[PDB]
Structures are given as C-alpha cells and as structure tokens.
C-alpha cells in the first residue's frame, strides 16, 4: 500500500500549470458625414428658398 501510494504521490507532485493569455481588442471606426444646405435668397422680388 505504501509503494502504491508513493507512485501516485509522484504523479501528484506536479507544479501548478500557469498559462499566459493574450486576448487583443482591435477597434476600427471610419466615418463620413456630408450635409448640404442650398440657399437662394432675394428679397427684392420676395423670392427666397
């Protein structure tokens, strides 16, 4: 029994396993906004849009 336990003990005497986890976040945002106000104002003939 002592020997069997010793063999298992040998298996157990294992270093805790560390892992380095590198998860990377990549965010890309591309933005285009165009607004056009087209304006014709004349008050002489009262024409204005």
């Amino acid at each position: 029994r002592l020997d069997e336990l010793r063999r298992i003990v040998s298996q157990l005497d294992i270093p805790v396993r560390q892992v380095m986890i590198e998860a990377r976040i990549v965010e890309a945002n591309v933005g285009y906004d165009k607004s056009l106000g087209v304006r014709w104002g004349g008050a002489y003939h009262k024409g204005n849009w």
Binding site: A43, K46, G47, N48
Partner: peptide
C-alpha cells in the same frame, strides 16, 4: 390660408421685402 406651409397674406396685411422674405424663408 394655406396649411402645409400655411399662408394667408391678409393677416400680415394687417402687419413686402422684409415681411415676405422672412415669412417665405421656409
């Protein structure tokens, strides 16, 4: 008077180059 872009020139006849310009800005 209109409605969609309401207009009734008599009411502001009570009130041309200045009044209509603004009124008609729309």
């Amino acid at each position: 008077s209109g409605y969609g872009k309401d207009g009734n020139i008599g009411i502001k006849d009570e009130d041309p180059f200045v009044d209509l310009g603004a009124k008609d800005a729309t």
